[PDB]
Paper text:
The 2.05-Å-resolution GyrA55–SD8 complex structure contains two GyrA55 monomers in the ASU, although they do not form the biologically relevant homodimer. Instead, two distinct homodimers can be generated from these monomers by the addition of crystallographic symmetry-related monomers. One of the resultant homodimers binds two crystallographically equivalent SD8 molecules in a novel conformation. The conformation of the SD8 in GyrA55–SD8 is significantly different to that observed in the previous study, principally because it is bound entirely within one GyrA55 homodimer. The polyketide moiety has shifted to a position where it spans the interface between the two GyrA monomers, with SD8 forming hydrogen-bonding interactions with residues from each monomer, specifically as follows: direct hydrogen-bonding interactions with His80, Gly81, and Met120 (from the adjacent monomer) and indirect hydrogen-bonding interactions (via water molecules) with Pro79 and Asp87 (from the adjacent monomer). The aminocoumarin moiety is bound to the protein through hydrogen-bonding interactions with Lys42, His45, Arg91, and Ser172 and hydrophobic contacts with Val44. In order to accommodate SD8 in this new binding configuration, a single cis bond is required in the tetraene linker adjacent to the ester linkage with the olivose and is fully consistent with the observed electron density. The only significant change is that the N-terminal end of α-helix 3 partially unwinds (it becomes two residues shorter), allowing the protein main chain in this region to move in order to accommodate the polyketide moiety of one SD8 molecule and, in so doing, projects the side chain of Asp87 toward the symmetry-related SD8 molecule, such that it hydrogen bonds, via a water molecule, to the ester group connecting the tetraene linker to the olivose sugar.
DNA gyrase is the only type II topoisomerase capable of catalyzing DNA supercoiling, in a reaction driven by ATP hydrolysis. DNA gyrase consists of two subunits, GyrA and GyrB (97 kDa and 90 kDa, respectively, in Escherichia coli), forming an A2B2 complex in the active enzyme. The N-terminal domain of GyrB is the site of ATP hydrolysis, while DNA cleavage and strand passage occur at the interface between the C-terminal domain of GyrB and the N-terminal domain of GyrA. A new GyrA NTD fragment was constructed with a view of obtaining a crystal structure of SD8 bound to GyrA in an alternative conformation that would be representative of the situation at lower ligand concentrations. This smaller 55-kDa NTD fragment of GyrA (GyrA55), comprising residues 30–522 of the 875-amino-acid wild-type sequence (compared with residues 2–522 for GyrA59), crucially lacks residues spanning Leu17 to Asp23 that have been identified as providing 10 of the 12 protein–protein hydrogen bonds responsible for stabilizing the tetramer at the dimer–dimer interface in the crystal structure of the GyrA59–SD8 complex.
Numbering used by the authors:
A (entry chain A), B (entry chain A): 33 to 174, 179 to 245, 259 to 282, 292 to 305, 315 to 425, 430 to 521
Write the structure that this text describes.
């Protein structure tokens, strides 16, 4: 019921986006019918059959609901007049490009996973988000009430915090002057913004921009129009190219109608598994600390993966340099178990890959009796099984070359990853550069006037 | 909305059972949560989110609903008193053993498949059922109304029809004297049974077996009890070990209460894509004709599959008999494309598999320039790619032996399949023997007294 402070998501949102990721329902592939994603979420992650899962998909696609849409939707996803989306069998969805940034590096052991409801699947506890989504898209529930914000502004605030962790709320507000609604309009109550940013709680007012061009966030246009007719105890000329409501009285309309509304900001989020009231700085610090954890864990993962792969490739290169005796050995083995034991029994000469093979690339788990030792290769059982799994086409010149090239590139990736892990400065710089690139790729203009 | 005469299923039932088959949710594996199957059905086959999919799962598991349950359910699936099943996240299901007979040989091109709703999946149009499910489990909908029947009886009727296609309705009724309800009780109206079997339509009456031990099919026990209290302008002592309702008056109760109900038999099913009223003989003939189509198509499929596999294995055996020159060829090939062209360029000597290799096993699509020709093997490109895909462990003695043994068994399977396809007598005998085995494995005692 409360969003996680780190990714801004509640469980239902996270389960939806996760299912889309697992489906490969990517920004650069064909749309899928909404029903497919709904069915996957219901069966694997959120085993309830009411309207919440599809409702969440629909909200995440509506440009009048989310400041940065997380779902790219095609078809009828409803309108600001409150009409419903078409049924899930008709609408088409895929991940928005920015949703890939929310889930960047999820496959790289960057976040803890928890059991799904039947213990057959894992689900991330939180997304390894590059986007400060809690602030930029906001959240509500009945309690928390966090308005959306401009991504450029929020990223600038994160970077200012990284530069000076003692930055004041006033300092942060030089970069983040207030909320930014997808529906634009006007905010009127600067003290309310400051009190929210300082304490977590502050009430602000949102005013429409007689011709009405923009209305407050979360106001239903058709209901607004009916409300005006009822108080009159007007035409809607809006279209695809923008909103246009046609109607002294204006101040009166602002006084008794949703042409002005209050927004009670109440920044409550899950923080270390507990609900907590959080100010602007708490929220930014939590996001930054999350980036530190993610990037560290990612770098460790990549280093491990690269060493593991390089280790398998060493075996393959040695076998392919010793192809005749390898074949002679396997052909005379009664069974695959005996071939594997014969492979590991006696070390192998390195041949023309000697220079290429001769500590940085050794997996940390590899005991000292294995690997290159005195110009000879001592294979593990796993390495022997990889030789036994080699297809005959890997003996052709090009496939042999590709393996050697892959090994060489891994050696360079490993040296680089060690330099990064070994340097707090490098690691912090990766974090910053990632934020800055997010700003360059996805940052847009402010819409709401403060 | 109407069941297919051949499998007795409506689309929703077929989509449920199909999803369970695709999931591998088999009788001899662990139960899965109902929600998983629901989610898969909704996402892939039946993209509507109301109660129908789960309701269908629940009905198929209830021993008071289906004469032969198609779902094996564990947990609370509701009762004859009309209480609801527990929610889908709590109940556990797998296919009943007999449901595997309903879908036997589905993977062997035995039935036509149709597009699912988004054109990303195939769904069978009908199941290749060994079970005459329309009769044994019945159907209803608002119209068709077909009561359930005893499997032993119905199979005996099918076999009697196969022996004499001119069998009369009276002849069939020597094997099938009437319906058989899962809830037992008593049928009172033999003319109604005969008129239904002769014409498709007949009305019959079902009577409870004061102590009530059995009640009519589709009667809710709790509602029956309330109905008796209302007319009285009694205790339920039923338990896990059987039904027991405790209450001259009896005849009166039979006259004004569901201790007796009418069942209007109306045997309407889909037949060649059209709704048709069908008599007993029409229904049996349709099932038998379906078995003829299935077994023919299955036999053709197996023959094709076996020839295809044998053809790939011939290439592998020849390569493994020529392992040195094969390796020399591939090692000196600049790329896998050049290795493949070199493999196919020149025919191969047969070596010690000559006797084993030397028309019955040739795929029907294989042009005469390929295969064994004058003691030499001419490879296709596909066969060359299979050699290139061979893992080094296939050179060990045991893996080499397993390949040769597989080829030998395929040769014998192919000779047998040709004998069957070539003989209407053999083919009809397979059909009969399959029915008889169904009767032996799944046949049980009559429950309802006529
Ligand atoms: C507290 C509560 O509501 O409990 C519900 C309970 C009463 O009912 C459960 C339920 C309903 C119906 C059925 C079921 C249920 O469990 C049987 O599971 C059932 O599915 C039912 C069936 O009908 C069957 O009968 C049925 O009828 C249909 C189907 C398909 C299946 C079934 O045959 C069988 C099955 O057993 C769902 C259950 O819901 C849950 O467990 C969890 C709900 C989570 C909702 C989160 C909503 C979030 C909204 C939200 O965040 N608003 C947002 C914002 O304000 C918001 C603001 C800013 C912003 O940026 C964002 Cl992104 C925002 O995003 C937002 O989403
Ligand atoms: C004619 C009709 O009823 O149309 C329905 C239409 C009115 O409503 C459709 C529908 C309902 C709800 C929703 C939807 C629908 O399309 C949105 O698809 C929706 O799912 C809805 C949502 O709530 C969402 O809002 C929602 O609220 C919940 C979820 C999870 C998804 C959504 O957020 C979004 C989604 O767009 C379903 C739609 O149903 C169908 O298309 C097909 C229904 C087939 C039913 C077959 C029942 C068979 C019973 C039967 O055979 N009885 C049996 C016997 O008597 C019987 C007798 C003997 C025997 O042996 C057997 Cl086996 C027997 O078996 C039997 O089954």
């Amino acid at each position: 019921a409360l969003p996680d402070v780190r990714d801004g998501l509640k469980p239902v949102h996270r389960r939806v986006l996760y299912a889309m990721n697992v489906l490969g329902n990517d920004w650069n592939k064909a749309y899928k019918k909404s029903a497919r994603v709904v069915g996957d979420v219901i069966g694997k992650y959120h085993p309830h059959g009411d309207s919440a899962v599809y409702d969440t998909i629909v909200r995440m696609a509506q440009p009048f609901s989310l400041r940065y849409m997380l779902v790219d939707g095609q078809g009828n996803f409803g309108s600001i007049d409150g009409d419903s989306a078409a049924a899930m069998r008709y609408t088409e969805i895929r991940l928005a490009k920015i949703a890939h940034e929310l889930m960047a590096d999820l496959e790289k052991e960057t976040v803890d996973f928890v059991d799904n409801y039947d213990g057959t699947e894992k689900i991330p506890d939180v997304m390894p988000t590059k986007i400060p989504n809690l602030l930029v898209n906001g959240s509500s529930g009945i309690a928390t009430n966090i308005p959306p914000h401009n991504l450029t502004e929020v990223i600038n605030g994160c970077l200012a915090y990284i530069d000076d962790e003692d930055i004041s709320i006033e300092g942060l507000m030089e970069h983040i002057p207030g909320p930014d609604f997808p529906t634009a309009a006007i905010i009127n109550g600067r003290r309310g913004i400051e009190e929210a940013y300082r304490t977590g709680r502050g009430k602000v007012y949102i005013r429409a921009r007689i011709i009405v061009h923009e209305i407050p966030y979360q106001v239903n246009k058709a209901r607004l129009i009916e409300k005006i007719a009822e108080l009159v105890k007007l035409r809607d000329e809006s279209d695809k190219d923008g909103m246009r409501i046609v109607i002294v009285v204006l101040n009166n309309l602002y006084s008794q109608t949703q042409l002005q509304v209050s927004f009670g900001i109440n920044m409550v989020a899950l923080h270390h598994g507990q609900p907590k009231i959080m100010n602007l700085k708490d929220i930014i610090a939590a996001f930054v600390r999350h980036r530190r954890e993610v990037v560290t864990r990612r770098t460790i993962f990549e280093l491990r993966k690269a060493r593991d792969r390089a280790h398998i490739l060493e075996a393959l290169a040695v076998a392919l340099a010793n192809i005749d005796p390898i074949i002679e050995l396997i052909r005379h083995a009664p069974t695959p178990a005996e071939a594997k034991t014969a492979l590991v029994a006696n070390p192998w000469q390195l041949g023309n890959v000697a220079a290429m093979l001769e500590d940085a690339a050794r997996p940390e788990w590899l005991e000292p009796e294995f690997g290159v030792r005195d110009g000879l290769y001592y294979l593990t059982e796993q390495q022997a099984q990889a030789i036994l799994d080699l297809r005959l086409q890997k003996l052709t010149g090009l496939e042999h070359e590709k393996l050697l090239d892959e090994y060489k590139e891994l050696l360079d990736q490993i040296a680089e990853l060690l330099r990064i892990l070994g340097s707090a400065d490098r690691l912090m710089e990766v974090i910053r550069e990632e934020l800055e690139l997010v700003r360059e790729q996805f940052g847009d203009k402010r819409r709401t006037e403060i």
